């Protein structure tokens, strides 16, 4: 069924809450035993958001290999993503260790450091060229190279140096700065423009490791980003684009991380973004 008609049908009948609860009921349940070990309590932001054991990213250290992060591997679309929580005061070094070890080119951030008057993640990158950051627990150095501030997003060039080997790499930071404190955006236009800027950079392409994408918990806004990207690519690749079923794609992604898409409003917004984005994919 053409999602655009499915959309109007759900909208006229006002059944978004019912559709969304169906997804919650059918979603996969896999173990997350490592996340729940006592030694990892200060590595999790939220008690009820954990990576599954089978898909969690492992840090390359013998001490403790745990980070709250998951690999979402989309086989038909030929895209992979790492979804993670916003870094905590005690996990900023782990976060950049994972970026290094997984050979990522881009980091996508969908929240502000403070929202609703509370801290939603650590200030984990440098704000001035001449004030670099050193993460002593993981032996990394991070320097701000340049910053481009636009009305709806900011893009930063960063240098990450492995101090053990003195290798350096350029990392691109894509920061969507205008998601509202409550609810979802009224139009998907600026979110789609942002997605296309990330694509254009190479950060989603198979010559690099998976993009790292986060918000506060790494499931709501972060799930909207990867869901929209994968659905648009499938519409490009298939003979019949109307065969792409956004609920089926979301359930496939939920095999790899729990809770993706947190509200019925986020589900509706994801439909809207794909419907409007397709009017470029099909050739306009």
């Amino acid at each position: 069924m053409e999602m655009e008609k499915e959309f109007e049908q759900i909208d006229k009948s006002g059944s978004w809450a019912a559709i969304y609860q169906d997804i919650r009921h059918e979603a996969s349940d896999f173990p997350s035993r490592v996340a729940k070990l006592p030694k990892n309590k200060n590595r999790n932001r939220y008690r009820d958001v954990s990576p599954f054991d089978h898909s969690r990213i492992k840090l390359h250290q013998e001490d403790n290999d745990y980070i709250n992060a998951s690999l979402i591997k989309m086989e038909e679309a030929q895209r992979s993503y790492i979804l993670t929580q916003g870094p905590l005061p005690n996990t900023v070094g782990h976060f950049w260790e994972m970026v290094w070890e997984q050979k990522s080119r881009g980091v996508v951030m969908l929240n502000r450091v403070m929202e609703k008057g509370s801290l939603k993640c650590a200030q984990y990158w440098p704000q001035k060229e001449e004030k670099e950051m050193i993460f002593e627990d993981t032996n990394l150095k991070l320097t701000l190279i340049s910053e481009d501030i636009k009305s709806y997003y900011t893009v930063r060039q960063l240098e990450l140096e492995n101090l053990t080997t003195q290798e350096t790499r350029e990392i691109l930071h894509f920061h969507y700065t205008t998601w509202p404190d409550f609810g979802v955006p009224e139009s998907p236009a600026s979110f789609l423009n942002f997605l296309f800027k990330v694509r254009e950079s190479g950060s989603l392409s198979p010559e690099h490791g998976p993009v790292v994408v986060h918000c506060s918990a790494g499931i709501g806004r972060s799930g909207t980003f990867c869901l929209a990207d994968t659905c648009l690519l499938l519409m490009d690749k298939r003979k019949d684009p109307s065969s792409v079923d956004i609920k089926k794609v979301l359930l496939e992604m939920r095999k790899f991380r729990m809770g993706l898409i947190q509200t019925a409003d986020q589900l509706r917004f994801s439909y809207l973004a794909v419907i409007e984005g397709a009017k470029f994919i099909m050739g306009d």
Side-chain angles (χ1 to χ4, degrees):
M1 193 183 173
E2 160 65 337
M3 65 199 306
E4 181 149 23
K5 319 295 168 45
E6 208 212 319
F7 178 93
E8 260 136 26
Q9 184 195 336
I10 300 159
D11 232 19
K12 92 182 185 307
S13 38
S15 38
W16 282 110
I19 299 313
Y20 179 66
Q21 183 60 33
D22 292 4
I23 289 163
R24 294 200 34 172
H25 180 270
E26 280 299 314
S28 300
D29 189 28
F30 294 112
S32 303
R33 277 161 218 140
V34 180
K36 283 332 207 142
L37 294 176
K39 71 181 173 144
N40 291 324
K41 170 222 145 283
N42 75 350
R43 292 183 181 213
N44 295 311
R45 183 174 288 284
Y46 296 113
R47 306 265 83 53
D48 60 322
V49 181
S50 303
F52 297 140
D53 296 319
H54 79 89
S55 55
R56 77 183 181 93
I57 300 290
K58 299 177 184 180
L59 307 172
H60 300 175
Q61 33 162 311
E62 329 157 3
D63 181 41
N64 182 345
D65 69 9
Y66 179 74
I67 182 171
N68 194 317
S70 309
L71 179 66
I72 288 49
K73 183 153 20 183
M74 303 305 284
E75 179 198 5
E76 184 188 359
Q78 283 296 286
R79 277 274 220 260
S80 296
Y81 318 83
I82 292 168
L83 267 62
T84 194
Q85 69 186 14
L88 291 156
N90 288 296
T91 71
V92 289
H94 306 150
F95 177 89
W96 289 113
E97 177 185 1
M98 160 177 82
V99 167
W100 183 268
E101 286 167 358
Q102 302 299 314
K103 299 185 162 52
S104 309
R105 179 73 190 320
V107 171
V108 171
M109 164 178 188
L110 302 171
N111 65 286
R112 294 167 296 284
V113 164
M114 176 163 290
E115 300 182 3
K116 297 173 164 167
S118 293
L119 296 174
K120 301 289 163 194
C121 81
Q123 181 63 50
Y124 66 86
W125 72 94
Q127 303 188 273
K128 292 178 170 138
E129 286 89 339
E130 70 275 13
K131 295 286 217 184
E132 74 274 11
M133 296 178 71
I134 293 181
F135 303 100
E136 277 182 23
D137 61 337
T138 54
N139 210 225
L140 291 157
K141 182 174 93 171
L142 184 65
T143 307
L144 176 67
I145 300 304
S146 75
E147 197 169 35
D148 200 345
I149 302 173
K150 302 269 165 43
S151 52
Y152 284 92
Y153 72 99
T154 297
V155 181
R156 318 183 167 89
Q157 294 183 126
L158 309 172
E159 196 205 47
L160 189 63
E161 184 183 342
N162 184 333
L163 291 173
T164 300
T165 68
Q166 307 189 130
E167 310 164 65
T168 62
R169 284 177 209 160
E170 181 173 272
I171 309 299
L172 299 176
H173 195 240
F174 289 92
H175 188 182
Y176 188 79
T177 52
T178 56
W179 197 293
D181 263 15
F182 292 95
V184 307
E186 181 173 305
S187 159
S190 62
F191 190 72
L192 287 166
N193 277 309
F194 176 75
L195 169 60
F196 298 150
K197 294 285 144 122
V198 181
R199 279 182 172 198
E200 279 171 18
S201 82
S203 290
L204 287 163
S205 299
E207 59 247 49
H208 302 291
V211 68
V212 171
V213 351
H214 78 89
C215 45
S216 193
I219 61 176
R221 310 173 183 172
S222 289
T224 302
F225 183 87
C226 62
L227 183 60
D229 182 55
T230 283
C231 283
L232 290 168
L233 218 48
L234 290 171
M235 279 163 87
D236 252 349
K237 211 182 190 93
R238 289 183 179 175
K239 271 189 215 175
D240 180 11
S242 69
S243 82
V244 173
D245 183 339
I246 177 163
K247 304 182 291 234
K248 282 176 182 144
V249 176
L250 177 53
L251 286 163
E252 178 68 25
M253 283 184 167
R254 277 197 179 211
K255 299 178 182 174
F256 299 93
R257 188 170 176 85
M258 70 167 65
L260 305 179
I261 308 297
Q262 273 183 292
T263 70
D265 226 349
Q266 281 177 6
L267 184 65
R268 181 180 188 274
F269 180 75
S270 294
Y271 272 75
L272 249 179
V274 175
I275 294 159
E276 292 302 308
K279 313 176 187 291
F280 167 77
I281 293 332
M282 186 75 259
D284 194 345

